[PDB]
DNA sequence: GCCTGGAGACTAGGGAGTAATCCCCTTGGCGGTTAAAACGCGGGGGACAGCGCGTACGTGCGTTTAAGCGGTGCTAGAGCTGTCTACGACCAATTGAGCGGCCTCGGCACCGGGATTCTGAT
DNA sequence: ATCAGAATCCCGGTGCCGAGGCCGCTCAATTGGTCGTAGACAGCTCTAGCACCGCTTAAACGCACGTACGCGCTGTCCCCCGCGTTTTAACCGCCAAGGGGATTACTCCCTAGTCTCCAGGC
């Protein structure tokens, strides 16, 4: 009953390759590796929920969208993203952005 | 930038702390914890028809992906406003983390 | 069952006797139906509570009269009691 | 140009909306609010039209009565503008809070 | 007169026969929205031509948002082609267009109160409920939306011809209640 | 700008509700306070109505469910069934 | 021949239906004969009173059809019925046109 | 000079004392005589059980204490300390008693 | 009669002290006597109605509790 | 003569008291208050279950109606723990004879 | 015939399941009453009694007493928010009020 | 002419009406006496009126946008109906749990005296 | 800060009455069996609730600007609070008498239950 959404993230990607390298070595059992990944997902969710303060806006064309299994998948084109560091707005022009979403609480 | 690095350090510390108890519960020595954390830190530092979308794969470092939660979605004919939450984004080999975002999209 | 239950016919008869050339909206009909049901439920509940307080098992004219006195304000209670006793007297006389 | 004296248009709206019977909240945002609130209790709930209309009638009645009490207790403080402390006082006396 | 209405939205229906497993359709196809609990259908849209396909469980699909009727059938052809690409084999049958909507502007102020008074039994006007008056006609069965600005909405027509006579019929009545 | 559903109870709507209540002058924080109060009231009444619905093993909230929810709290409502 | 109980009592409300609702409504194991007659008379009187005041309100607004606004005026203008229905909301009824004296212009 | 306490010190001491205690604050014979005079208007030659008058007194004192709490709250709302009858009238109006 | 004056100025002052009141105006006493008289007339009216329904001439404690219960002032401590 | 029996929840309240507080006693007036509280909550839940059975055109009061009436009257935490205790008791009673 | 066992003992309750069942049957609430309804209701009554009695015993300990008086029940009820919500319209005889003085009335320096 | 509650007749059982009794409890009176109410006074501090200032709120105007309308789709789900079976009413015999009465002793209350705290003037 | 007086808190002693336990009894709860019917469940129908479109237009919103008003400050005077003295009536106890509430027993009328006709609505 807990979201597997943040596995694809770069931080998550780094963890999955590191566990895979460890499993290849054989230092630990695979079920434990799954357990660690689940813990990572839970910890990352709460820290994102509270420990971040940055504000940003996406202005762009919408190439494709999808909504299946309570997952919203937006492909956004020529985005004008303005991000401010916590410690000024910075304009970045990005050709393509993939938005993967999920409802706060799933039923 | 700075904020993303600091938050990433909180994730690293918190996860490494929490994980050890299950490792010890099943007979895994504390050396593995250090090994996983150091190699993991090193990789983060170094790394920083048309209709059918079934044939979709992670392009690589170049692609830009948003993993986030959606508060609610609004429906308009041209505009496609959508409120998003708890998202980590990677654009131009840089990591930007946010709690909430607003995306406005255009239906061509 | 498909058939339902409403007080509309009686309310219409009362409306004609009181004001012959006035209609009533359907929404106002739903309001009057819910008003009659709510006042009936209040009076019947108070009368049932009354019969339970006195260890009785029957709802009589006395329990309905006392529940009318208790729930209805003084002028309304006095005139509703007069109406009820007049109706009970007429009903018993004709048997 | 000519500008209406302050408080005349407020009284005009008071007389207008106290003479009327229409609903003062737009039906679609109120329906969206109702569905959002209802989601927290039971998921995949459908709502009858008349149910949302009854909810809106009750909400507007409750808020109009609260505003009446708020105005009375703001006049009691020898004021005209109503502040949230007036609402908190009215609710506290009513027993809502 | 000197005005001809322009068709904007065509509402068409197509049945496909075999029952569909919507989950595969939602996953494979793009521009699709399938919330099963709220609605038992997937909402699908294609950029060119702009249309909205609602694909249901029994196989019946509803295409709307089409400027023309040939454009509507062409859009249905595109939807059928892509659904064939999804992996479900179905044959198009019983194509029919039940409703088309037409927008025209007379470009001259009209008085709604006179029209309401003249046709009070025939038609109903309610200012607070709507700033326009609905106009129901026994023959042709075309609902008419009338406005103070003079924008006339034509709806309820199986074919274009039916709205065209209905607009022609309404034009003298609109001229009668002209302002100044 | 996209707003929360609770913000869908717009400032003019609250001002009309105040005008019907006789409120000549409204502060700026009355709107947020009224949105919070209305959210609390709606939460209570919709929770009671959804409980009434779940007892009947229905998936649709009926107007009679809302009427029975309101009636128990003494905020009776006429016009949607008795 | 059969005569309805309402005509015997001299009422328009159905004594039989009120008796059925009392017997089936789980108020007591037994219901007296005079109770539905009395209750129907009280309900009919209250209906006649409310409808009389609503018809007066409708005539005041130059209407020939009772709408919820006239029911609200009938309830909230009479003091006894406002005490009776003080916790009751009437849908599409609005409020009484009352403005506080302090807010009136100087 | 004799010893004197500044105004409001003893009022607060009474507030703490009577909020700490639970006895009835109205004398029982005056309240009983008031109850019987009022009951003379409904039925003549009425008799009252002792526990009935005690229940009436507990209910009356609790009602008056809650009313004075609301009266004090709406007096403080007007940036005041002294309660006037308009405070009582406001509290009874808001509660739906007028 | 003079019995309403039996609700003395110190008794009303003590009731206000339990309510948390620090200063009392001279007219609170007459206002409170009027409020208490209205409340007592309501409760005793309902209680005598309950008594008369039971064909009794004595107001029992159950009459007072029952009367308070339908005015929403449920009282614990006197039975029922 | 001998006074007719007047049933009360005094001994049951005293048993529950000796369970939660084995050394704490209770006065007679506090016992009368607890008896009034048990009677009041009993008649509230029973009236709500009666109205609940009447609304759904049913004629039996079961654990379903009592459970829904507990969810209705009692506050959320109280309702959750009362439903848990009632469900546990009905389960244990159905498991036995 | 086997030895009689009380319904409360079967349910593991102290409150009387049989008396609650008879009161539900005689109370004119429905023509029929389920078997698990008095069990459920007796469990709910026992739980609410246990909550108030535990809080009242705590209040009596706080006043260095070993008997529960109406004051302790009043303190227990009005000090818990949920129970005060449940008994908002309820008056507890000889209970007093909660010690509560508004901060504006306190003296100043 | 075809019906779904309603009226008519009849029976049987029990609930309510009525009459006598008893004893509880309410009502009425006397007296002491003491604490509480009433009354006078003076002072201070708070209610209240006036002023003043800046500020936030009303008003208007142009812009935007979403609420409302109308229509159509379909299918989930409300509603209704038939059938059967588990489950609750009922009844009778039994008997232990719960209540009335009685006793007794400890928690609490009353008194009094020292210790602590708090308030106000210095 | 300080100090003295007044009020409250705490500690101990004595008493007293009410709560807690025991016993006896009786009646309501329990157990076992029967039976009738409500409710569960499956199956069929068909309504309306949740999507989509687009048009229109009045309503929301953002902002500019000015001004009524809220809130802070100041002065005044009046009336509420603290306290001391006097008066009074509430409270406790004690007694007495009789009304009336509760109980029991007998009767009889009144309402549920059932069956059969029926009468307004269609």
């Amino acid at each position: 009953g807990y979201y597997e959404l943040y596995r694809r993230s770069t931080i998550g990607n780094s963890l999955v390759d590191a566990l895979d390298t460890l499993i290849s070595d054989g230092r630990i059992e695979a079920s434990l590796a799954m357990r660690v990944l689940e813990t990572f997902d839970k910890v990352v969710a709460e820290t994102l929920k509270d420990n971040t303060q940055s504000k940003l806006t996406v202005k762009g064309n919408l190439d494709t969208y999808g909504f299946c299994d309570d997952v919203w998948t937006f492909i956004v084109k020529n985005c004008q993203v303005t991000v401010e560091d916590s410690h000024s707005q910075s304009v970045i022009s990005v050709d393509k952005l993939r938005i993967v979403a999920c409802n706060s609480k799933k039923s | 930038n700075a904020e993303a690095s600091r938050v990433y350090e909180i994730i690293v510390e918190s996860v490494v702390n929490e994980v050890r108890e299950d490792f010890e519960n099943a007979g895994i020595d504390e050396q593995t914890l250090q090994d996983l954390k150091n190699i993991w830190q090193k990789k983060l530092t170094e790394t920083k028809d048309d209709y059918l979308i079934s044939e979709g794969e992670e392009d690589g470092p170049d692609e830009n992906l948003m993993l986030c939660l959606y508060d609610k979605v609004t429906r308009t004919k041209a505009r496609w406003k959508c409120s998003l939450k708890d998202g980590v984004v990677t654009i131009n080999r840089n990591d930007y983390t946010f709690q909430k975002a607003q995306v406005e999209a255009e239906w061509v | 069952k498909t058939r339902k239950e409403s007080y509309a016919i009686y309310v219409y008869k009362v409306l004609k006797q009181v004001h012959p050339d006035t209609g009533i909206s359907s929404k106002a009909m739903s309001i009057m139906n819910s008003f009659v049901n709510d006042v009936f439920e209040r009076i019947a509940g108070e009368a049932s509570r009354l019969a339970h307080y006195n260890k009785r098992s029957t709802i009589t004219s006395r329990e309905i009269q006392t529940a009318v006195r208790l729930l209805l304000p003084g002028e309304l209670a006095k005139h509703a009691v007069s109406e009820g006793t007049k109706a009970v007297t007429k009903y018993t006389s004709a048997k | 140009p000519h500008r209406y004296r302050p408080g005349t248009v407020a009284l005009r709206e008071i007389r207008r909306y106290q003479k009327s019977t229409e609903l003062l909240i737009r039906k679609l945002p109120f329906q969206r609010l109702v569905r959002e609130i209802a989601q927290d209790f039971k998921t995949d709930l459908r709502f009858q039209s008349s149910a949302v209309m009854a909810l809106q009638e009750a909400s507007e009645a409750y808020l109009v009565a609260l505003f009446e009490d708020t105005n009375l207790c703001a006049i009691h403080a020898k004021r005209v503008t109503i502040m949230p402390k007036d609402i908190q006082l009215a609710r506290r006396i009513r027993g809502e809070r | 007169s000197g005005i001809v209405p322009t068709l904007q939205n065509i509402v068409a229906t197509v049945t496909l026969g075999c029952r569909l497993d919507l989950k595969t359709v939602a996953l494979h196809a793009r521009n699709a929205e399938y919330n099963p609990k709220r609605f038992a259908a997937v909402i699908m849209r294609i950029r060119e031509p702009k249309t909205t396909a609602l694909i249901f469980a029994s196989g019946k699909m509803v295409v709307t948002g089409a400027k023309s009727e040939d454009d509507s059938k062409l859009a249905s052809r595109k939807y059928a082609r892509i659904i064939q690409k999804i992996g479900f084999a179905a044959k198009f049958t019983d194509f029919k267009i039940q409703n088309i909507v037409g927008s025209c502007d007379v470009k001259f102020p009209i008085r709604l109160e006179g029209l309401a008074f003249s046709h009070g039994t025939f038609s109903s006007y309610e200012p607070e409920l709507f700033p326009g008056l609905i106009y129901r006609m026994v023959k042709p069965k075309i609902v008419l939306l009338i406005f103070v600005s003079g924008k006339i909405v034509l709806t309820g027509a199986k074919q274009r011809e039916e709205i065209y006579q209905a607009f022609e019929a309404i034009y003298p009545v609109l001229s009668e209640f002209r302002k100044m | 700008v996209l707003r929360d559903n609770i913000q869908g109870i717009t400032k003019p709507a609250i001002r009309r509700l105040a005008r019907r209540g006789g409120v000549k002058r409204i502060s700026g924080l009355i709107y947020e306070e009224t949105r919070g109060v209305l959210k609390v009231f709606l939460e209570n009444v919709i929770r009671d109505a959804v409980t009434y619905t779940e007892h009947a093993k229905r998936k649709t909230v009926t107007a009679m469910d809302v009427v029975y929810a309101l009636k128990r709290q003494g905020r009776t409502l006429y016009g949607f069934g008795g | 021949k059969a005569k309805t109980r309402s005509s015997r009592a001299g009422l328009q409300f159905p004594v039989g239906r009120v008796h059925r609702l009392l017997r089936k409504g789980n108020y007591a194991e037994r219901v007296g004969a005079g109770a539905p007659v009395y209750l129907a008379a009280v309900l009919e009187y209250l209906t006649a009173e409310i409808l009389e005041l609503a018809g007066n309100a409708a005539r005041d607004n130059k209407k020939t059809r009772i709408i919820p606004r006239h029911l609200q005026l009938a309830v909230r203008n009479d003091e006894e019925l406002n005490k009776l229905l003080g916790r009751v909301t009437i849908a599409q009824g609005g409020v009484l046109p009352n403005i506080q004296s302090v807010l009136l212009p100087k």
Side-chain angles (χ1 to χ4, degrees), chain A, chain B, chain C, chain D, chain E, chain F, chain G:
Chain A
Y2 182 75
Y3 291 164
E4 293 83 3
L5 183 153
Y6 301 97
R7 291 180 187 268
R8 296 145 74 172
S9 81
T10 49
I11 296 89
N13 204 352
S14 286
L15 283 296
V16 65
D17 67 278
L19 299 103
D20 198 35
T21 60
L22 188 158
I23 193 66
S24 67
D25 285 19
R27 293 182 183 174
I28 294 169
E29 190 276 337
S31 81
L32 295 174
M34 294 299 102
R35 298 295 297 163
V36 175
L37 276 195
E38 158 174 292
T39 61
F40 179 78
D41 291 305
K42 183 181 178 67
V43 65
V44 72
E46 313 99 355
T47 187
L48 280 295
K49 182 172 72 63
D50 60 358
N51 297 114
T52 183
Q53 295 296 109
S54 64
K55 299 289 94 176
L56 80 165
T57 295
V58 168
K59 183 69 180 294
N61 284 269
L62 178 66
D63 186 15
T64 62
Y65 60 94
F67 180 52
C68 183
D69 279 340
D70 196 320
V71 179
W72 263 114
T73 306
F74 297 161
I75 297 298
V76 179
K77 275 270 154 63
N78 67 8
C79 309
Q80 212 188 6
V81 59
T82 58
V83 176
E84 57 90 14
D85 59 350
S86 290
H87 315 89
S88 177
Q89 297 294 322
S90 296
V91 177
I92 297 89
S93 294
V94 64
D95 48 18
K96 181 175 76 175
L97 183 61
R98 182 174 292 171
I99 301 299
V100 181
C102 289
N103 179 294
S104 81
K105 64 182 182 293
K106 66 181 178 292
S107 64
Chain B
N1 292 112
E3 192 275 331
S5 44
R6 187 209 58 236
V7 68
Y8 290 164
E9 294 294 323
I10 192 166
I11 299 90
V12 174
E13 295 319 292
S14 60
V15 71
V16 66
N17 184 356
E18 211 282 333
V19 66
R20 66 178 64 89
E21 55 92 18
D22 273 342
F23 276 6
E24 293 292 328
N25 193 359
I28 300 302
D29 61 358
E30 179 68 27
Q31 185 61 46
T32 60
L33 284 296
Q34 282 72 61
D35 301 333
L36 61 78
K37 182 176 73 177
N38 65 8
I39 62 173
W40 170 31
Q41 287 173 352
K42 298 292 180 65
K43 61 190 68 178
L44 287 71
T45 57
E46 58 90 14
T47 194
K48 186 177 184 292
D49 214 347
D50 54 3
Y51 301 78
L52 294 175
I53 59 170
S54 295
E55 194 253 344
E57 294 87 359
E58 297 291 326
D59 304 335
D62 56 356
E63 65 92 20
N64 317 293
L65 185 159
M66 201 173 304
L67 287 174
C68 63
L69 296 177
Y70 68 83
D71 189 358
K72 66 94 173 182
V73 180
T74 300
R75 180 66 179 86
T76 300
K77 308 150 198 213
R79 277 88 53 91
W80 183 258
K81 293 179 289 294
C82 189
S83 69
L84 279 299
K85 275 170 71 205
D86 298 5
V88 289
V89 299
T90 302
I91 301 96
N92 311 96
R93 313 306 313 288
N94 304 122
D95 268 330
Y96 292 165
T97 181
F98 69 85
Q99 70 272 27
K100 65 86 176 178
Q102 295 298 109
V103 305
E104 63 86 20
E106 192 35 67
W107 205 92
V108 182
Chain C
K1 289 176 106 176
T2 174
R3 179 73 276 172
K4 200 52 70 177
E5 209 277 321
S6 175
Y7 283 95
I9 296 89
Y10 319 103
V11 164
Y12 291 166
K13 289 191 285 183
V14 171
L15 184 48
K16 284 73 178 177
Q17 65 183 357
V18 175
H19 278 116
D21 293 330
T22 300
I24 175 158
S25 178
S26 68
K27 182 68 176 177
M29 188 77 269
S30 184
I31 290 173
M32 287 275 111
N33 187 94
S34 88
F35 158 79
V36 169
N37 282 327
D38 166 50
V39 168
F40 169 87
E41 190 276 331
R42 276 150 74 161
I43 294 177
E46 194 49 47
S48 176
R49 214 167 302 139
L50 267 184
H52 182 285
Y53 292 160
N54 306 113
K55 280 73 176 175
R56 303 306 193 78
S57 59
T58 305
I59 307 293
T60 59
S61 296
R62 284 188 83 261
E63 282 91 306
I64 300 288
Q65 178 165 187
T66 304
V68 160
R69 292 181 184 271
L70 282 157
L71 291 168
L72 293 200
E75 294 293 328
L76 291 176
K78 183 177 289 293
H79 296 147
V81 159
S82 179
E83 274 302 306
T85 62
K86 185 182 287 184
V88 170
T89 291
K90 182 179 184 287
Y91 177 89
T92 299
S93 66
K95 173 62 186 181
Chain D
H2 180 78
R3 300 283 299 273
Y4 285 166
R5 194 73 163 71
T8 61
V9 183
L11 284 155
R12 222 162 56 214
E13 318 187 308
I14 286 174
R15 298 191 177 89
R16 161 181 180 178
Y17 292 120
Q18 284 193 351
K19 184 178 184 293
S20 178
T21 48
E22 65 183 1
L23 295 178
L24 309 164
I25 306 169
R26 306 277 56 101
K27 296 186 178 62
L28 215 52
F30 188 87
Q31 202 195 106
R32 278 200 311 273
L33 171 66
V34 173
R35 291 187 194 275
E36 160 184 323
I37 286 156
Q39 264 295 115
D40 310 331
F41 309 125
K42 186 184 183 292
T43 62
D44 56 300
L45 265 169
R46 294 181 103 74
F47 268 81
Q48 290 195 354
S49 66
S50 56
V52 172
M53 293 298 102
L55 276 165
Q56 181 152 213
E57 182 65 26
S59 301
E60 292 197 0
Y62 170 73
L63 282 184
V64 159
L66 188 52
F67 275 135
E68 267 150 8
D69 287 334
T70 303
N71 193 216
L72 280 178
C73 80
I75 294 157
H76 181 82
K78 295 184 289 294
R79 276 187 280 101
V80 165
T81 307
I82 63 156
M83 282 74 74
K85 64 182 180 292
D86 304 319
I87 292 194
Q88 298 173 359
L89 181 81
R91 287 197 71 222
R92 165 67 187 80
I93 302 196
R94 293 178 69 88
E96 267 291 327
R97 90 169 73 217
Chain E
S1 68
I3 305 98
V4 54
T6 61
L7 275 297
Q8 185 176 2
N9 182 359
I10 312 307
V11 191
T13 310
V14 176
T15 189
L16 299 181
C18 63
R19 185 179 296 113
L20 298 177
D21 187 74
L22 281 72
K23 182 67 181 288
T24 76
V25 175
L27 294 174
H28 291 86
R30 68 179 179 180
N31 297 115
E33 315 183 303
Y34 176 42
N35 180 351
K37 295 155 291 294
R38 298 294 296 166
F39 198 42
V42 67
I43 295 93
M44 185 179 289
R45 286 187 206 86
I46 58 171
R47 298 295 185 264
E48 190 276 331
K50 183 181 184 293
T51 61
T52 303
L54 279 77
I55 322 294
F56 285 85
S58 69
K60 316 173 187 175
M61 64 179 288
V62 180
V63 189
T64 187
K67 301 291 153 199
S68 188
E69 69 275 16
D70 62 358
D71 195 328
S72 72
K73 60 186 62 69
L74 186 152
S76 69
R77 300 290 77 193
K78 300 284 185 67
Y79 279 122
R81 181 67 179 87
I82 63 172
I83 199 180
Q84 288 325 320
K85 294 203 74 61
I86 299 301
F88 272 105
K91 295 301 291 182
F92 63 96
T93 69
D94 192 14
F95 171 91
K96 65 182 181 293
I97 290 169
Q98 300 183 8
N99 199 320
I100 65 171
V101 295
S103 66
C104 64
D105 189 356
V106 285
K107 296 293 292 296
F108 78 82
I110 56 176
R111 294 179 293 173
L112 294 204
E113 65 273 41
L115 188 46
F117 187 44
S118 161
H119 296 98
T121 64
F122 187 76
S123 173
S124 89
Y125 172 54
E126 293 293 328
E128 69 275 12
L129 188 153
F130 201 39
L133 65 88
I134 63 172
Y135 196 55
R136 325 194 167 272
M137 293 178 71
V138 177
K139 182 69 176 176
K141 199 194 195 59
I142 306 299
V143 162
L144 266 175
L145 282 177
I146 304 299
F147 284 99
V148 304
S149 170
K151 295 180 176 67
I152 295 92
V153 189
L154 271 300
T155 178
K158 299 292 184 289
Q159 290 88 14
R160 48 176 64 249
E161 291 81 3
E162 192 200 0
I163 47 169
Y164 281 157
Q165 70 272 19
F167 166 61
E168 289 294 328
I170 198 60
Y171 193 75
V173 175
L174 298 172
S175 66
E176 179 68 28
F177 298 111
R178 171 188 291 266
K179 188 62 181 68
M180 293 177 70
Chain F
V1 173
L2 185 147
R3 33 181 189 256
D4 189 358
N5 280 303
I6 183 57
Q7 304 288 296
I9 306 300
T10 62
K11 181 174 72 68
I14 305 183
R15 290 176 56 81
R16 289 189 294 266
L17 286 167
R19 294 297 194 256
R20 183 172 290 178
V23 172
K24 181 156 154 268
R25 198 146 168 107
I26 304 147
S27 162
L29 281 72
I30 279 297
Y31 310 122
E32 294 293 328
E33 192 82 0
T34 302
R35 286 181 192 114
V37 165
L38 170 68
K39 183 176 174 65
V40 165
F41 168 81
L42 273 186
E43 272 162 3
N44 282 5
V45 171
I46 296 169
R47 183 188 330 113
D48 272 13
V50 167
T51 292
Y52 270 115
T53 286
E54 290 179 353
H55 183 252
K57 290 146 179 311
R58 276 190 271 99
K59 296 183 289 294
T60 62
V61 179
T62 304
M64 294 300 290
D65 296 359
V66 182
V67 166
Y68 302 144
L70 288 171
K71 185 188 294 153
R72 185 180 65 256
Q73 294 180 356
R75 293 180 183 177
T76 303
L77 174 68
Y78 286 179
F80 301 87
Chain G
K1 193 51 177 58
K3 295 184 290 294
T4 199
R5 282 194 278 167
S6 297
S7 70
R8 214 181 326 271
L11 306 172
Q12 314 293 299
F13 275 10
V15 176
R17 169 198 293 210
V18 170
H19 196 205
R20 184 187 74 246
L21 288 176
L22 282 177
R23 275 194 282 89
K24 299 293 94 176
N26 275 288
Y27 299 114
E29 62 87 14
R30 288 174 66 253
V31 171
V37 170
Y38 202 112
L39 190 39
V42 167
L43 289 179
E44 183 187 300
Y45 165 76
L46 287 180
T47 297
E49 187 66 284
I50 193 66
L51 285 185
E52 183 179 1
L53 302 179
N56 298 344
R59 291 187 289 107
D60 291 331
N61 297 115
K62 298 298 293 295
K63 300 294 187 292
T64 79
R65 198 178 177 82
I66 303 185
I67 70 183
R69 180 59 184 172
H70 308 143
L71 295 173
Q72 182 82 350
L73 292 177
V75 167
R76 303 316 169 192
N77 271 335
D78 181 281
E79 69 275 13
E80 302 281 38
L81 277 161
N82 182 72
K83 185 182 287 185
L84 182 60
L85 309 178
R87 297 298 272 141
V88 168
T89 301
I90 286 175
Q92 295 297 109
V95 308
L96 283 188
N98 178 348
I99 308 192
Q100 292 295 319
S101 65
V102 179
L103 313 178
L104 292 180
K106 73 194 172 66

